[PDB]
Amino acid sequence: DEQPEPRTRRRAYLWCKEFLPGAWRGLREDEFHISVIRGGLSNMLFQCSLPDTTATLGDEPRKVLLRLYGAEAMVLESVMFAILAERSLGPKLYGIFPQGRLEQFIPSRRLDTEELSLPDISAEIAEKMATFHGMKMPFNKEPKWLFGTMEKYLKEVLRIKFTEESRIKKLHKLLSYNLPLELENLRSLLESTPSPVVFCHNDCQEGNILLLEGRENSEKQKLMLIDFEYSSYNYRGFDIGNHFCEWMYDYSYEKYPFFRANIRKYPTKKQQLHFISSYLPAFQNDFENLSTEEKSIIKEEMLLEVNRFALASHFLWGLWSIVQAKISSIEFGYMDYAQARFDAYFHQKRKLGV
Amino acid sequence: QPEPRTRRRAYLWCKEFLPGAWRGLREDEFHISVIRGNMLFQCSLPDTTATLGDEPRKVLLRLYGAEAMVLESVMFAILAERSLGPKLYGIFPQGRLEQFIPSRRLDTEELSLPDISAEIAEKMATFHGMKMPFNKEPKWLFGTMEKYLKEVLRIKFTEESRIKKLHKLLSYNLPLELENLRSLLESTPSPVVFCHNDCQEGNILLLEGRENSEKQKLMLIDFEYSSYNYRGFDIGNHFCEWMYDYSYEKYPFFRANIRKYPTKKQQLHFISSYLPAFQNDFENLSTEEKSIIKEEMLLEVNRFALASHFLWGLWSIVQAKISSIEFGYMDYAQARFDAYFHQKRKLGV
Numbered sequence: 152d153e154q155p156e157p158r159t160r161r162r163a164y165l166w167c168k169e170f171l172p173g174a175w176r177g178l179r180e181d182e183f184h185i186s187v188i189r190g191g192l193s194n195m196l197f198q199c200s201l202p203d204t205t206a207t208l209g210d211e212p213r214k215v216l217l218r219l220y221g222a223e224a225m226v227l228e229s230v231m232f233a234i235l236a237e238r239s240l241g242p243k244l245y246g247i248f249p250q251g252r253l254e255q256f257i258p259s260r261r262l263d264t265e266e267l268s269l270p271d272i273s274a275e276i277a278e279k280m281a282t283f284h285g286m287k288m289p290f291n292k293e294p295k296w297l298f299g300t301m302e303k304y305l306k307e308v309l310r311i312k313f314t315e316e317s318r319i320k321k322l323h324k325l326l327s328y329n330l331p332l333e334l335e336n337l338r339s340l341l342e343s344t345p346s347p348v349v350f351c352h353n354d355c356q357e358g359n360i361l362l363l364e365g366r367e368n369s370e371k372q373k374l375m376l377i378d379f380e381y382s383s384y385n386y387r388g389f390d391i392g393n394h395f396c397e398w399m400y401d402y403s404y405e406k407y408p409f410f411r412a413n414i415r416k417y418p419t420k421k422q423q424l425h426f427i428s429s430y431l432p433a434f435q436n437d438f439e440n441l442s443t444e445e446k447s448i449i450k451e452e453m454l455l456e457v458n459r460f461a462l463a464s465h466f467l468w469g470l471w472s473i474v475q476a477k478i479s480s481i482e483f484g485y486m487d488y489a490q491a492r493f494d495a496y497f498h499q500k501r502k503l504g505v
Numbered sequence: 506q507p508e509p510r511t512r513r514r515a516y517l518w519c520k521e522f523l524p525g526a527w528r529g530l531r532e533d534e535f536h537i538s539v540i541r542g543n544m545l546f547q548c549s550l551p552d553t554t555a556t557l558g559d560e561p562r563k564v565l566l567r568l569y570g571a572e573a574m575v576l577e578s579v580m581f582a583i584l585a586e587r588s589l590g591p592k593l594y595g596i597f598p599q600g601r602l603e604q605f606i607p608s609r610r611l612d613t614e615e616l617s618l619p620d621i622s623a624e625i626a627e628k629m630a631t632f633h634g635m636k637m638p639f640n641k642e643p644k645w646l647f648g649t650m651e652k653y654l655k656e657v658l659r660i661k662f663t664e665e666s667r668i669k670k671l672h673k674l675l676s677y678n679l680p681l682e683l684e685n686l687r688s689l690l691e692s693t694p695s696p697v698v699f700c701h702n703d704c705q706e707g708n709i710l711l712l713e714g715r716e717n718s719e720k721q722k723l724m725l726i727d728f729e730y731s732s733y734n735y736r737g738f739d740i741g742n743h744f745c746e747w748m749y750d751y752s753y754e755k756y757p758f759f760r761a762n763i764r765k766y767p768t769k770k771q772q773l774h775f776i777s778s779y780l781p782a783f784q785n786d787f788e789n790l791s792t793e794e795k796s797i798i799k800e801e802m803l804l805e806v807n808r809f810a811l812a813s814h815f816l817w818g819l820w821s822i823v824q825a826k827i828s829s830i831e832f833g834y835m836d837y838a839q840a841r842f843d844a845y846f847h848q849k850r851k852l853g854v
């Protein structure tokens with residue numbers, strides 16, 4: 152129930168008063184209710200609401216989420232959020248302004264990492280993912296995001312110099328793998344791994360999945376995927392592979408390095424099959440009406456596909472994490488997260504026999 | 506034809522943003538011609554190229570040229586999603602790809618046809634009712650008039666005849682006049698609504714093959730100046746456009762005709778169509794109550810029309826300095842002010 156600093160309170164009041172219709176337009180500053188949802192140095196969240204004793208005038212919301220950035224991609228993220236809201240595939244957009252936005256408040260909690268493996272959950276994550284992999288979005292259709300971003304991080308990574316000895320020591324270990332050659336070896340493997348270019352979330356982890364309040368007894372319609380800011384047209388294998396990788400990481404751990412990694416929490420073949428059996432009919436529409444041997448061939452190939460791209464999830468977020476150790480001031484063990492992603496990378500390679 | 510650099514940029518945008526036969530277009534294959542310009546262009550496959558299906562054969566490319574883009578972009582995307590504007594096919598830093606709508610623009614003379622007018626009023630009402638994630642304080646109208654007035658007072662032209670016209674315009678005492686206008690409009694109730702702000706014939710498409718529809722043959726396009734504004738401004742502004750023909754083939758490249766302003770009857774025809782499309786419980790009011798609403802509405806829009814003359818008059822002065830396009834802006838500015846003083850005389854205000 153934490154209060155923002157009184158200058159933020161005033162700015163939030165004005166945005167709510169001017170952007171929101173109905174009882175909000177005539178609210179005084181002293182009637183305004185706000186509490187921090189999440190702090191941090193950027194992308195801060197607040198809940199704003201009317202007094203309980205204030206009646207609504209029409210269909211205006213009683214309660215909204217304020218998102219403050221704390222600063223091209225700005226236009227792309229804004230248009231995407233607007234489109235998704237229009238398609239009921241995300242929170243409504245109530246206000247956009249240079250410092251942030253006002254969004255629909257969705258009563259909910261995020262999933263915990265252990266919940267990702269629950270069959271009803273997985274099935275539904277697979278369906279939602281298939282669904283927006285299917286949609287049209289006014290963005291560049293060339294799949295350059297994946298390797299373009301890896302190349303960009305690699306370049307930054309090679310330029311990095313740390314001063315603190317345990318960071319320099321850890322950086323020496325990661326560099327000793329020859330990351331540029333590893334990149335090329337990975338590129339070449341993925342060039343021979345067919346994967347359809349689709350519109351990808353790119354960050355489908357539990358923290359970005361909402362368990363809808365009141366819908367816990369719905370078997371197949373209780374979730375919403377959020378936080379599409381890293382979306383792009385990309386290889387389907389990445390979006391799915393990346394999601395499977397996230398089974399292994401728990402970001403709620405309270406001691407340094409502030410995550411737990413468990414190589415044994417990666418989904419089993421049966422768990423993967425259950426995920427892709429739910430994905431496939433939702434994305435192909437009459438997939439169930441194929442011969443069993445053809446369904447099977449598609450499924451076995453898609454498993455190879457997402458498991459090879461899972462390797463790009465490790466390599467890419469490994470590199471990202473090294474970069475974060477340099478530029479971020481967040482309390483998170485970035486170097487240790489990097490080493491965990493590379494460990495998983497080579498363990499995955501050995502498993503696949505590549 | 507366009508600049509060979511613009512041709513190249515445009516070719517890559519179509520190739521990378523659009524599905525099907527666009528994805529493997531070779532380069533010598535790209536058809537593109539200029540259509541306006543904030544430049545517009547038509548991009549197409551050659552006739553020879555068959556579609557892989559579902560992808561447009563023709564598209565419009567828009568370049569912004571000389572944050573506003575964020576708002577305009579979100580806005581266009583919303584209208585496309587709602588089926589109110591052209592579809593959005595690509596969005597990028599310098600501009601966008603849009604659906605090409607087989608259509609032509611209306612001519613000035615067509616604004617006054619009863620069916621056209623009735624439908625313009627209905628589309629406007631519908632545009633007005635919609636919710637948009639933008640600032641709802643109606644600060645647009647006078648904020649923009651202030652900003653242009655300030656620039657106009659600093660403006661200096663090099664050429665003598667422009668200096669001479671600016672001097673006549675400045676002698677009306679525009680700062681005092683702005684305050685009289687403000688005070689008149691602060692006492693004229695007008696609901697705040699999502700306004701188009703530029704509802705003229707150049708921005709209204711007559712849809713191809715739909716010419717026989719009495720009530721559904723048009724789309725309002727080009728909403729880049731949109732904002733929450735007083736409803737009276739959009740309407741009065743639209744009325745003032747009955748006076749101006751922008752297809753005049755010689756200098757100053759417009760005809761102004763004060764007698765073409767809608768008559769009371771034509772105004773009533775427009776608002777009788779607007780009201781039931783904006784309120785919807787309006788059709789069920791008593792006859793006398795409708796009559797009261799309409800007569801107040803005539804005063805309302807006619808008074809706001811003064812702000813259309815005043816604002817675009819000032820705007821036109823600034824454009825004279827910066828726009829190298831061919832249009833006599835100083836003469837248009839004078840035409841708007843003549844109209845402003847005539848309308849004040851007509852109103853007793």
Ligand SMILES: CN(C)c1cc[n+](Cc2ccc(-c3ccc(Cn4cnc(N)c5ncnc4-5)cc3)cc2)cc1
Nearest residue numbers: 189190191353354356358381402468471481482483488
């Ligand atoms: C799409 N991108 C840029 C990705 C980057 C990294 N990954 C791997 C990954 C995922 C989550 C996390 C992570 C770390 C900490 C948290 C917890 N947390 C969440 N919010 C905050 N403000 C936090 N401040 C400190 N810790 C905060 C949540 C997620 C770290 C790395 C996936 C995608």
Ligand SMILES: CN(C)c1cc[n+](Cc2ccc(-c3ccc(Cn4cnc(N)c5ncnc4-5)cc3)cc2)cc1
Nearest residue numbers: 541542702703705707730751752817820830831832837
């Ligand atoms: C909402 N805003 C910014 C407005 C500004 C001015 N007005 C009044 C007005 C409207 C149209 C025009 C105008 C002028 C010329 C044209 C013709 N035209 C049309 N397209 C071009 N590329 C032209 N190049 C030269 N002339 C061109 C069309 C409309 C001038 C003033 C209304 C709204």
Ligand SMILES: Nc1nc[n+](Cc2ccccc2)c2[nH]cnc12
Nearest residue numbers: 188216242254255256257259260
């Ligand atoms: N638009 C949103 N609505 C709800 N949540 C989740 C949320 C629930 C309870 C408390 C705090 C946050 C979001 N998390 C991110 N966006 C939203």
Ligand SMILES: Nc1nc[n+](Cc2ccccc2)c2[nH]cnc12
Nearest residue numbers: 540565591603604605606608726
């Ligand atoms: N999206 C559009 N589709 C069609 N027109 C009108 C148009 C037709 C033929 C040639 C030139 C313009 C527009 N004018 C502005 N936008 C459009």
